[PDB]
Amino acid sequence: MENDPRVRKFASDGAQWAIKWQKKGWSTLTSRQKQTARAAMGIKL
């Protein structure tokens, strides 16, 4: 995942985590944001 469409949907929804994850890079989220993301995106990473 570099710019996944799911991430774009959330970022368009106003999901700050996805907005950051997509644009600023997946590094820029904290564990809680990534963890929130894992729930929405179904991510195991």
21 and 4 Cβ atoms separated by less than 8 Å? no
Crossing angle of the two packed helices 16-23 and 5-13, in degrees rounded to 10:
130
Question: Using what technique was this structure determined?
Answer: NMR
6-27-24 Cα angle (round to 5): 65
Single-letter amino acid code for the residue at 17: W
Nearest to 36 by CA among 13, 14, 12, 18: 18
Q: Tokens 């469409």 appear where?
A: 5
CA distance 44 to 12: 23
Nearest to 5 by CA among 27, 39, 13, 36: 13
